[PDB]
Design an enzyme around this catalytic site. Structure first.
Site, PDB file in Angstrom:
ATOM      1  N   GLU A  52      -7.581  -8.798  -7.041  1.00 38.04           N
ATOM      2  CA  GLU A  52      -6.549  -7.615  -6.805  1.00 38.04           C
ATOM      3  C   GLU A  52      -5.791  -8.271  -8.315  1.00 38.04           C
ATOM      4  OE1 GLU A  52      -4.414  -8.409  -3.375  1.00 38.04           O
ATOM      5  OE2 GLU A  52      -5.332  -6.386  -2.700  1.00 38.04           O
ATOM      6  N   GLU A  97     -11.633  -4.817   1.308  1.00 37.92           N
ATOM      7  CA  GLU A  97     -11.193  -5.257   2.147  1.00 37.92           C
ATOM      8  C   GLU A  97     -10.553  -3.775   2.885  1.00 37.92           C
ATOM      9  OE1 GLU A  97      -8.378  -7.986   0.781  1.00 37.92           O
ATOM     10  OE2 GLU A  97      -9.187  -8.733  -1.077  1.00 37.92           O
TER      11      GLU A  97
HETATM   12  C1  LIG Z   1       5.665 -12.379  -5.511  1.00 39.94           C
HETATM   13  C2  LIG Z   1       4.864 -12.923  -4.494  1.00 39.94           C
HETATM   14  C3  LIG Z   1       2.994 -12.506  -4.505  1.00 39.94           C
HETATM   15  C4  LIG Z   1       2.325 -13.076  -3.937  1.00 39.94           C
HETATM   16  C5  LIG Z   1       0.812 -12.733  -3.854  1.00 39.94           C
HETATM   17  C6  LIG Z   1       1.032 -11.773  -2.811  1.00 39.94           C
HETATM   18  C7  LIG Z   1      -0.690 -11.391  -2.222  1.00 39.94           C
HETATM   19  C8  LIG Z   1      -0.335 -10.213  -0.466  1.00 39.94           C
HETATM   20  O1  LIG Z   1      -0.954  -9.631  -0.332  1.00 39.94           O
HETATM   21  C9  LIG Z   1      -0.906  -8.338  -0.923  1.00 39.94           C
HETATM   22  O2  LIG Z   1      -0.051  -6.943  -0.038  1.00 39.94           O
HETATM   23  C10 LIG Z   1       0.423  -6.219  -1.641  1.00 39.94           C
HETATM   24  C11 LIG Z   1       1.214  -5.965  -0.562  1.00 39.94           C
HETATM   25  O3  LIG Z   1       1.209  -4.981   0.748  1.00 39.94           O
HETATM   26  C12 LIG Z   1      -1.312  -5.793  -0.991  1.00 39.94           C
HETATM   27  O4  LIG Z   1      -1.829  -4.293  -1.674  1.00 39.94           O
HETATM   28  C13 LIG Z   1      -2.338  -6.693  -1.762  1.00 39.94           C
HETATM   29  O5  LIG Z   1      -3.891  -5.357  -1.287  1.00 39.94           O
HETATM   30  C14 LIG Z   1      -2.674  -7.600  -0.339  1.00 39.94           C
HETATM   31  O6  LIG Z   1      -3.628  -8.070  -1.200  1.00 39.94           O
END
Ligand SMILES: CCCCCCCCO[C@@H]1O[C@H](CO)[C@@H](O)[C@H](O)[C@H]1O
Ligand SMILES: CCCCCCCCO[C@@H]1O[C@H](CO)[C@@H](O)[C@H](O)[C@H]1O
Ligand SMILES: [Ca+2]
Lengths: 703, 706
Positions: B171, B338
């Site tokens: 991502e 996912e």
């Molecule tokens: C600021 C700290 C961030 C650390 C990384 C965290 C990743 C959390 O996970 C992410 O959350 C997002 C919001 O729901 C989703 O869109 C993503 O698909 C998911 O992978």
């Protein structure tokens, strides 16, 4: 013991339905009132929109002379004929998706610049938004009261008429909230100046609190822009205190004017704060009414509940709000002035099967009365709708009085309430847990909220790390309150301001969610509480400052606490629970002399201790946890069990919520299934039942 | 000609389950794989965490020498033995609620400050957030690739191993987005300066586009702080273009490095954007990948779907996201890298009865493959859990390999997919409506988003009134796309960049949601579309500026439109519908020349017209409406009916969603009830009526043999 409405000298569950006469075909007014009465509702509730009745300046129509639906007199007559009591709400503001929020177009066209709320630059915030204490606005408000109040006086319950309550205005401050913006009208800023002078008396007194360098009160300006200095935090804190006095003055002016007409019925106000189906900000809004509630024991605040759906996602919102209203208003029944029926928004669905569960859960969660908002859909007359033609959807009745699916759900719930109200209204939960409501943490609607676009408060710029809104939203509202409700532990909330020591001593535990600042009065109260035999649980910080961020270490020194603030992994261990995720790298590391260490950082430093102080017990955790993991429920459970507090029931399925309500004769067990799963479970006191998804079961026991 | 995965030259529905070997007792690995296989899944998917295998700097364990669950080699071998294909995801970022998002503790302790993403002031945004093109970051990533990639290479399908796909990092940008701050690391600053010099060549050329007065390129800094001037907007616009080239550089560097190990398997990336169970910002994040998707036809992007519940509140998010991926990746199948199974967080429940409906809806909404995330729960070893000991809840299998409630739902869905995949994968919906995807409106992640701490973009300060983020969220995603799906009108989304006129002329209607700005190329394309015979619906604005907010009146002139912008009541009448609430006081007032006026302000000024232009039809509405009232659905229905477009079915309950998918042989009718009501309804094809009862939050599928 319990506070509840009374009718014919018996406990009465107030069942009101909102029916906007001004948005309904007057040929069908009787039909709406009859269908409402036929659900077992006893009361009907409506706005009397100033715009609708003062059709031009000094031209009043309450008799349907210019439009049949302006016949307020006949609607009142119909309420009497159909044996419904009446709640009337003449504004001046009604909101209610009415154009200009209920204010006349002729008035808004005619008011001066200086009648409107202004931003820091002197620009009008909104062509709909007057400043509450504008002399022009109060002049015209009074001339409106001069015509509608004699009608209300004539038909009040005190003259044996149907009008039992009147709401003053509508959700005071809701525009300061929803808009980014606070009112800098020169009249408001002058009142803020009188407030500051009255509070501090001399500029040297203000200077020693703020660390400012004014030569007089003439150098004092209303605070604005981002907070960069502790002096700016102090200025904004008093700007918050001033607005609570300001709203009290506004409502006091309306009340005195109302009372001058011989109106002696119950006066009301309504609390906003739900949005997107949760209410985590409603505690901030209710905090704006702190001075009204201290000064007006005769004004009953009701909640405006807008859950939109009923699931584990929002299950804790209505209980936490009901409990906070009970904290701020212990001498009056907890009730919903606006209790969701249908939806204000076509695209935001309100399912009968969702709302039916919400209604039953509201009973479990201690509600004593409500007004179905909206019982009847409306059709906005003559483009007077802020939005489209239609006011609300999926109501009990459509605007033409057709029964919709919610009608049968409301009839079912009302029939249960009427059968049980005599006993149910006199029941309470047995709370051994008290949770402290520290109002100054909530005083941030001008500087930090979910609705404020740009944050004026960044506590890091002040040498602080615990933001009071993050604390009160994530650690308190969505954390501890959500966790106790999920674990089926009863809590009460108590307002810590001018709080009676005797009213904390009934509870086996007092829980305080503390930032780094806390006034001397509260630090003294909590010190006395533990010294006299109280069990205190305090996290995430022992406070070391007062509300003005001046040194105040009363609680720290009284409890013999020493700490250094140190950076570590977010994860701690606590009571043998490993990998407890905490909100901050920065944690309090405690000297453990005369203490038991019970929590440790990843480098095994002490970030929580237990201690005996005088006759009482202290548990301090120098770390912040909410509810974002199973470890958090495990930690709340361990803490509650330090003082051997038990749930009332063993329920085989931990995802079933229950509330046990009892008096000496009657017990009600409410089982609530906030999940999309048919659940089968059994229960027994500290036996087998099936509950549909998003559903309920109520069980009676004679004791 | 649908796009689908193929196996043995036949349509193959990709069914994967996510099983984290590093969070499961290795004595239970085989049992997890067997139970996954027994659902009809063909593939298993896992991260290979850098932190887990490089236990200290230059100390690697892939064999379980230091911990049994570090035996990656044995896990690969078991996948082969249990006849599952394997997706591997070696990072360097995995996120995955793993400590430090998968990066070694020893690395983050060792790296210098300049390896980290930095705010405008030069401070570290987050202790686990590296700057992607940091020399030091890529050096250690390369040394991690030096050890994991030879193992992945040896175990590829083409060498008779189970490995069929590998994900590059995880991502890209999601961490920066959630942090609420963009990266101002000096590598970023210096690369941006090179980008700007390469783009403009001379400071005079940049000055003429931005209206600035710089003496040289040395005077120009990467933009910081709020946009107050159109020249600040221009600088931020180029900074957005720069970030798409920057992410392309990151993934190119990873891809070139991977290829050098003889790894020839399909490479993947995974699209973030769901938060709190909606995906209205996912289009902004997918837009950050625009240069990757143009330069790398061999990288397949898949969606990360986290609906959390399945109701009308979020029904539209998965279809719009599937349609937007299709628009940006038209030559690969739509699939979910996912695909929510259980919940990442204990306090946000994932019910089997919701997710079973989401799975069926996803088939209705054209998904061709997915990876159940998480199929298997994990338990973090050795404190590796970021937020707690347990990884995921309410999965198909608990960490011990016990079947949970969701196992039966996945087995039911997979059974239907295996029975039907041969026809179902070849089915299309009959879309007569095309909705334009204008990517520059989404290029705001540096200046305006749901997650950005600072609101840098206030269009009113630029003499504009249509915010591109308000447009693309409320007027497009939560508005038009939601309204079409609710009304059961099939739509396709097409990327307007380098768009073939030929691939728009198929549709009865092209819908463009337009701001006041639009590039010359798009203005010309929409002009040609109408003149050559297309039916265009355009609102809320005829654009008059380009992407740099300089004059561009090509479409206005080509369509012979005159307008003045005037203030009025939010309410308009359109097509006889009164009290249509619109978003802006300001509206476009058209004169009546060679046109039929069909919308009127409260003062009866013309704010919408219909006209014939060459062989085509134009409908312009000078006002903004999403879906916030019943009038909005009536207006969308009226507009669709202008070209006699009809729903596939007459359904007696307007709140029932359906999708008809067909080929030559087979018709599938999907019925979806996104509401908490048992619904009994009748339906018929628009060509006796069948009665259906559908539970709350449920589905029916009917197959017909044609
Ligand atoms: C600021 C700290 C961030 C650390 C990384 C965290 C990743 C959390 O996970 C992410 O959350 C997002 C919001 O729901 C989703 O869109 C993503 O698909 C998911 O992978
Ligand atoms: C700034 C413009 C004000 C117009 C809208 C005012 C009334 C909107 O309605 C208000 O919405 C709030 C948010 O959900 C709720 O908390 C309140 O109960 C409700 O009355
Ligand atoms: Ca001590």
């Amino acid at each position: 013991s319990e506070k509840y409405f009374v009718k014919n000298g018996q406990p009465h569950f107030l069942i009101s339905g909102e029916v906007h006469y001004f948005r309904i075909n007057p040929k069908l007014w009787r039909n709406h009132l009859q269908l409402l009465k036929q659900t077992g509702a006893d009361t009907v509730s409506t706005y009397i929109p100033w715009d609708w009745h003062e059709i031009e300046e000094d031209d009043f129509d309450f008799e349907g002379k210019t439009h049949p639906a302006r016949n307020l007199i006949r609607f009142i007559k119909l309420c009497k004929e159909e044996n419904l009591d009446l709640i009337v709400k003449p504004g001046p503001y009604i909101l209610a998706e009415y154009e200009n929020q209920g204010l006349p177009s002729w008035l808004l066209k005619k008011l001066s610049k200086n009648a409107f709320a202004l931003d820091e630059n002197g620009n009008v915030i909104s062509p709909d938004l007057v400043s509450y204490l504008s002399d022009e606005f109060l002049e015209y408000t009074f001339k409106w009261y001069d015509k509608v109040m004699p009608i209300i006086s004539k038909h009040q319950k005190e003259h044996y008429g149907p009008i039992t309550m009147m709401q003053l205005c509508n959700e005071i401050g809701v525009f300061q909230w929803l808009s980014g913006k606070s009112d800098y009208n020169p009249k408001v800023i002058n009142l803020y100046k009188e407030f500051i002078i009255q509070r501090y008396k001399t500029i040297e007194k203000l200077n020693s609190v703020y660390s400012t360098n004014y030569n007089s009160f003439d150098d004092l300006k209303a605070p604005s822009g981002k907070i960069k200095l502790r002096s700016d935090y102090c200025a904004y804190f008093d700007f918050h205190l001033f607005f609570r006095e300001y709203y009290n003055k506004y409502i006091s002016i309306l009340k005195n004017k109302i009372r001058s007409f011989g109106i002696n019925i119950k006066l009301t106000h309504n609390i906003p704060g739900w949005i997107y189906g949760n209410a985590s900000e409603l505690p901030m809004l209710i905090s704006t009414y702190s001075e009204i509630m201290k000064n007006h024991p005769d004004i009953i605040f009701g909640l405006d509940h807008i859950p939109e759906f009923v699931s584990f996602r929002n299950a804790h919102s209505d209980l936490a709000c009901n409990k906070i209203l009970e904290a701020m208003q212990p001498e009056a029944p907890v009730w919903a002035a606006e209790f969701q029926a249908g939806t204000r928004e076509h695209h935001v669905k309100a399912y009968a099967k969702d709302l039916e569960t919400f209604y039953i859960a509201s009973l479990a969660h201690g509600i004593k009365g409500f007004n179905y908002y909206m019982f009847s859909q409306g059709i906005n007359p003559e483009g007077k709708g802020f939005y489209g033609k239609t006011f609300y959807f999926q109501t009990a009745l459509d605007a033409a009085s057709n029964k919709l699916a919610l009608y049968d759900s409301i009839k079912k719930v009302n029939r249960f309430i009427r059968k049980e109200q005599k006993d149910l209204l006199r029941t309470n939960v047995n709370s051994e847990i008290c949770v402290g409501f520290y109002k100054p943490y909530f005083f941030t609607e001008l500087i930090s909220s979910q609705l404020l676009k740009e944050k004026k408060l960044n506590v890091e710029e002040l040498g602080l790390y615990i933001d009071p809104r993050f604390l009160r939203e994530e650690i308190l509202f969505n954390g501890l309150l959500r966790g106790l409700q999920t674990l089926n532990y009863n809590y009460d909330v108590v307002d810590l301001e001018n709080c009676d020591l005797k009213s904390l001593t009934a509870y086996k535990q007092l829980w305080i969610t503390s930032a780094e600042f806390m006034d001397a009065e509260t630090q003294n109260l909590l010190s006395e509480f533990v010294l006299n035999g109280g069990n205190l649980i305090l996290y995430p910080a022992v406070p070391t400052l007062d509300n003005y961020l001046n040194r105040c270490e009363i609680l720290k020194n009284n409890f013999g606490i020493e700490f250094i603030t140190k950076d570590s992994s977010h994860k701690v261990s606590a009571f043998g629970i490993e990998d407890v995720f905490t909100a901050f790298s920065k944690k309090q590391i405690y000297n453990d002399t005369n203490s038991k260490p019970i929590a440790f950082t990843q480098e095994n430093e002490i970030c929580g201790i237990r201690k005996k102080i005088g006759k009482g017990e202290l548990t301090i955790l120098g770390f912040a946890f909410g509810y974002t993991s199973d470890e958090h429920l495990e930690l709340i459970d361990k803490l509650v069990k330090l003082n051997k507090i038990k749930r009332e029931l063993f329920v085989s399925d931990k995802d079933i919520q229950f509330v046990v309500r009892e008096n000496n004769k009657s017990r009600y067990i409410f089982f609530l299934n906030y999940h999309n799963e048919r659940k089968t479970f059994n229960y027994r006191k500290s036996e087998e039942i099936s509950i549909a998804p998003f559903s309920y079961k109520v069980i009676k026991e004679n004791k």
